[PDB]
RNA sequence: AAACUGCGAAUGGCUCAUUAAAUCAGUUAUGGUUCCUUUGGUCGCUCGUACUUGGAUAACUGUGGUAAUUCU
RNA sequence: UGGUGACUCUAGAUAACCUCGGGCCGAUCGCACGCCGGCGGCGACGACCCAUUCGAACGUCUGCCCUAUCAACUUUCGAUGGUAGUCGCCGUGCCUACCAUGGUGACCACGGGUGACGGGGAAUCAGGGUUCGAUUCCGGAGAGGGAGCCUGAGAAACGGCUACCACAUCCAAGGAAGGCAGCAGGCGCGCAAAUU
RNA sequence: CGCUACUACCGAUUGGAUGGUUUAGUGAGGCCCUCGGAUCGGCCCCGCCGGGAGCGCUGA
């Protein structure tokens, strides 16, 4: 029975104001959707005019973009590192808007490999299972060396990313609702953007 | 209690009327849609499962 | 107040449909269609209080039924179909064909038009919009859906649109000496050459129209329907011209028609 | 100065503004594209709203409304609130029994943006209806204009 | 006839208790939204038993319970 | 591509996603005629999307009676604004967290009173005005008082449901069933208003 | 000053009725969420030749 009227409301001078009417049908609101990180779990809700609301309590995979590589993948969340709005909505790990989220980056790293020879980290380590060893040599003709050794020129990831990418985490943002969509999607930070929320969490602890 | 009894196979139905608790003894504390041996009810109902 | 309504009562009615106030306190309620509620004329309306067809509903009901009343082509059975402005309303029965048009004192005037003029209409298009994968589309005032239209025809414009294709056959554009009528405010009914068109950025645009008898008006441009390239109508004017009589040149013409005739 | 002065980061949403960087393009600062667009109604966007640095999302050039309606005027008598001043719109009020006025008044807060700097109590401001801003404010501010007084 | 399904039952009618920038009136806006119905349009634009698929349930028949209901 | 005064519009391209409570891409129905293992003309109904037909909901501007024996009010429990979000059909302190200390007022705020629903309008009126407007048209509100919901496009619906409060009906005392400010008609109230 | 009547205030006693605001609890009922899983289904193992049994899995 909660409602988002206005005529409960003080006035902008500050007096009280008597309500003509009760709570009508079209002011109502509903129950929040604190989505949880969880195997997927979503109530559709039935909304003014026939429509359809998927309320999504529990997600646990979200289409995330790497928008410097235009590479958008649909990934594991992992976890809630920062909220802007409410600090207990990082206690108990609640997937909103704006929030700042843990996601895999092990498509992020195929997609990663497929443009072979991203910037040099730890590459010569005492590493190498086989069978991905291909993604990165490979056998091929002399055309398409040339198209990847061409590739390399724009293998330029920031440090920080290069950090991420060895935790296996990427620090995202969901760009989605999802409590009014149903999906947990958004973009992987970069910049100063990613700069700005790695200061924000550090001087959270 | 009166009893409503059913025949699916012949869709036939009958209405007894049993006042002995002895017989009734063995439908109570029983739920719906559970299988009991009606044999309680007398020797004609020996072998009948409802 | 919750949902919508679904009467009308018979003096809220629009006052163009010249209904009576003793007949009833219900007015017949348009139906939803092509034309605003106030800018119709019901086909019972037609049918009874202005045709005389029908001396009650319940003969516009037996009439239409009999699938007799044709509007734009189509067969219509709704004896409160709403029908406005450029309708064509065709009675092959009794074989006459009319063009829903508007009368100097803004109401529908029951205008016979010929076999070949009810072939085809004019509509004002409302608006022009690419969608659908590059495709354009057009909206007209009787809310027919036109794809691939010529890409010179804009808002405000006319086309001509043959009845049994619904498509168009040619256009007029909204310009200063094209010929037009006005469909609303206190200049209805009035036809003249659009003059000048004086524009209101945030606003409505006014456009002014000068009669074929050398008076001057002004309308808000959605209020405007081009009629005819220059001052040569596309399509067949009511007895009156579109030349708003005042009341002393009125009175005097009735009084000499009467001397006249009787 | 600094705009990130909130606990999420403050960005224009139409600018990508993390593209792929190249070593030799970059010459000191990875260099930010700004967003603005014009208001119609023959309203000129203020060269702060254009080279500024500033986020304001309810900021008739840079950020998401849109002007439609009442364009209206009033004199600044408040600034005391964030991006948000308090005008007073002075009017004549007509009693016709008496066939005279009375002086009324209303008082409208709406939207200032950063990209007026130099807006003092007593400037006269051409304000655009947009939509509601927040409980009070309808209202965005246009352009600026100073009081004779001023020096 | 019944009964299932579909639509309507949110209109109309009554009353004036509440309600003091509230309702309301004129004026504008939705470039900040929803929209059954009518009308026009879209409706092989998916590139991997169809010559027609499945299980129910009403109505109906039959057995009933309650002092009592448009109960079942 | 197209459009607006103005889009973060429309359209286009790319990389993905695509809700077990899953989005469309017809397993529907009547009439009439035909020439080798095939076609087909009129309709009815239904589904998706767009177009606002009909609205609804929210905003803008200006206008409301008496009262100071009501002069300061609002701000703990949102009061004014900012940021992020939640919810909603959407804009919005609608709500939440954090932040700022704001916002209204003798141009009468705030409070109180009203045998105050508002307006179109009515009576009176030389001119100006005074009083009335429950009442058939428009808008609002309510269905004994509150509150919460289902269904649905649309209701916080009451000739729908669910409670409590008041009143009240039948009962075999276990239970069941209510809502005339609809049309008539009773009671009551009154100076005061008609046919089951 | 007497002195029948009439209207109005302040009141010890809060003597009785009708109302509306509020602290502190308590709190029906619906809605939502997390559980639950009566019961009903098919998929799992057989005959008869037409050619009624399990928190095994799954859906409501």
Redesign the interface.
Known sequence: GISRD?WH?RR?TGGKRKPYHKKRKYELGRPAANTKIGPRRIHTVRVRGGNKKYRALRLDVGNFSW???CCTRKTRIIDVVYN??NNELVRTKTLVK?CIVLIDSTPYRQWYESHYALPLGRKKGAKLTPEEEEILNKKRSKKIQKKYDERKK?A?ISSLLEEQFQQGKLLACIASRPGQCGRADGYVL?????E??LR?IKARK | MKLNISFPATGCQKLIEVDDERKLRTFYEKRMATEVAADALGEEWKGYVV | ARGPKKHLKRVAAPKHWMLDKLTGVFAPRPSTGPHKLRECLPLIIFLRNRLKYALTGDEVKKICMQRFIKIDGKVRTDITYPAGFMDVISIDKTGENFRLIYDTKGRFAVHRITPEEAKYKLCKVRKIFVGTKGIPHLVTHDARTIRYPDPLIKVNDTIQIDLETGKITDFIKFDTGNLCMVTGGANLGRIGVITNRERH??SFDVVHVKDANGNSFATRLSNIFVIGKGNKPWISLPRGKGIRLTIAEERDKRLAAKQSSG | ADI?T????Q?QPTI????????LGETGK?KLPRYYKNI???FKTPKEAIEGTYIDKKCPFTGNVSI?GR?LSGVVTKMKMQRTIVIRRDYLHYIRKYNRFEKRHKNM?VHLSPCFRDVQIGDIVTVGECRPLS??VRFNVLKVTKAAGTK
């Open positions: 206005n409301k902008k928008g410097s590589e802007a709005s704006n724009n330029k970069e910049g100063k953007e990613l700005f929320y924000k | 950025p945030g | 990130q909130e606990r999420a980061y960005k990508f503004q993390n593209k792929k960087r190249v070593l990875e119609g109604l023959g439609r364009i807060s409980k009070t």
